[PDB]
Paper text:
The main protease (M pro) of coronaviruses plays a key role in viral replication, thus serving as a hot target for drug design. PF-00835231 is an inhibitor designed for the main protease of SARS-CoV that emerged in 2003, but its clinical trials were suspended due to the rapid disappearance of the SARS outbreak.
We also resolved the crystal structures of PF-00835231 in complex with SARS-CoV and [name]-CoV M pros at resolutions of 2.61 Å and 2.30 Å, respectively. In terms of overall structure, the M pros of SARS-CoV-2, SARS-CoV and [name]-CoV exhibit highly similar conformations when bound with PF-00835231. These observations provide a structural basis for how PF-00835231 binds with M pros from different coronaviruses and support that PF-00835231 can be used as a potent inhibitor with broad-spectrum potential to combat diseases caused by a variety of coronaviruses.
Author numbering:
A (entry chain B): 4 to 301
B (entry chain A): 3 to 301
Amino acid sequence: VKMSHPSGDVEACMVQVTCGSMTLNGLWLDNTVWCPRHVMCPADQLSDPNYDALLISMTNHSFSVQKHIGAPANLRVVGHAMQGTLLKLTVDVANPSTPAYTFTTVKPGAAFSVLACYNGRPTGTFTVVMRPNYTIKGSFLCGSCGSVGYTKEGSVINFCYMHQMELANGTHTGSAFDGTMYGAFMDKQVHQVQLTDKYCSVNVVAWLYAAILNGCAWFVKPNRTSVVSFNEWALANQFTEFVGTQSVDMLAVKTGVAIEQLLYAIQQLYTGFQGKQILGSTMLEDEFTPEDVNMQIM
Amino acid sequence: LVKMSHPSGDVEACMVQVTCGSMTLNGLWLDNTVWCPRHVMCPADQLSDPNYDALLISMTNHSFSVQKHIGAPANLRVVGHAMQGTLLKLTVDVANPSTPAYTFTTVKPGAAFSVLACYNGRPTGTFTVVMRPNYTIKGSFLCGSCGSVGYTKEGSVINFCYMHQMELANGTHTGSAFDGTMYGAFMDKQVHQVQLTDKYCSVNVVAWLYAAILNGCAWFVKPNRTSVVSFNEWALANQFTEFVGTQSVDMLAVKTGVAIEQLLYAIQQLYTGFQGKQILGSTMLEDEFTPEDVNMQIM
Ligand SMILES: *[C@@](O)(CO)[C@H](C[C@@H]1CCNC1=O)NC(=O)[C@H](CC(C)C)NC(=O)c1cc2c(OC)cccc2[nH]1
Ligand SMILES: *[C@@](O)(CO)[C@H](C[C@@H]1CCNC1=O)NC(=O)[C@H](CC(C)C)NC(=O)c1cc2c(OC)cccc2[nH]1
């Protein structure tokens, strides 16, 4: 099951940011509003913007911030700065419902929750994994820029994504909160090509373990491939590096099946499924992490 | 096409923990009323054959402890208690100051809704399920999840449709509507129960094929057509639900130009075999996406 964190924490932080005739979502934490910087850019310049000239041309009053959740309010902007592909706006009132938070960058294969927003109003939530080519496969429509992606550890939200674009293949990307765009895509209105996607090997392993736990173990055999041998094969068949984790070990102890058997099985199941099914799938499944398998199948 | 849930913040502000004896589970706080599954009155020795009428009469308002954890912690004093089908309807003296606009409508097979999974009154995760024709759902419910709540949102109104009660040996799940009746008439006792046979949700297979077409996957479309009446008599023989068209479906017909009866014909052929070919990454029919899903996500 694709399970998301409860989103109420993050809903209380979503705002609408308007600049000239551009409008998108922003994140209100304490005295700061984060939002994508292209809100500054008029339409006649989206294809080829000069963000530094645009930033100089803005004043605090160029920016309009509104809260539509709970007690609606207008937030007075009293400072503006740019950080990579984000604007960092300072407002005069602190968000009284600010969670404990950090900013982290997610590595490919890691899962996180997304709150999709339109005009500062939360509309849906879903879970994604960062692909090896630094894209995600969510559902983002018009007005979804500034929607936020995050994980939770205890009561602390770790913010990891702010939405910026949709590639022509329907896939999506955005920034970490240091301003850097995932996959180095540029925040301008141009057709851009992503690198070839790969399978997240550790996720495929975790999924096969989940199959065995539910009683589906047909692919299991005594044939082993070593970690180092599998990884050499992976470079030629568009798989990531396998890296072991204690999470994967838990799933090998409980299952009594070695990673090396599953690594061999991956090579053979990639060749083809020979007609059968694994957990309702006829293709490899790489969007469930070892942590998901550990928490869901007990 | 992706599994998508409503934002859960509205519902999180309504969850409470309900304790009775050595028993504890989740509750839903709306106005002055807390709903929860009635088996919280039963001790675990007796769950196999609970005497719910006798349990209710032996309970006093002090037999129930309702605790709110999300936000500012408080104990909610019980000043009334009643039973309605498989649910308890407790009256507390403090009205929930964050009660959303809501309705209580039972969902039909093939409809999708969002679940807030909770443990001892604390929300832990959210996901979407669809009600199967055998009145089960397939989410992720662990120990302590009874009282977790299922819902849909239209505009500002929350429609509460599901209160979690049980896990079948199949790994599948069921619970109550908020009128107190159990989906599929499963009984709320610690006994083995076998669900009825599943079916494919016909109207959702149609929606998914429309989604295939919109995304450039249309090899399965032929000129050939099966009427709704002819398809439905076939559905009875082949474990499909009766196809009932809606405006939501017709919208997809118009955007694509592929009529409903073309997809009904295609389904009959696809159910016999995809012949190695794929539709949206699948070698099998998919019925977990509704027409509304396809409209919102692809248009
Ligand atoms: C945000 O709403 C914008 O603030 C918007 C979200 C997408 C609109 C449709 N679905 C979405 O997810 N983002 C964009 O419009 C961005 C803006 C950039 C970062 C300045 N641009 C694109 O997503 C974009 C541009 C182009 C393109 O050009 C030419 C050609 C093809 C695809 C494409 N996507
Ligand atoms: C609630 O958390 C309980 O308050 C719990 C939820 C399930 C636990 C695992 N996943 C869930 O959805 N509910 C139960 O444990 C209920 C309680 C009964 C009605 C008193 N029981 C079952 O779901 C149950 C009992 C049995 C069983 O017996 C023997 C045999 C097989 C399956 C089964 N399920």
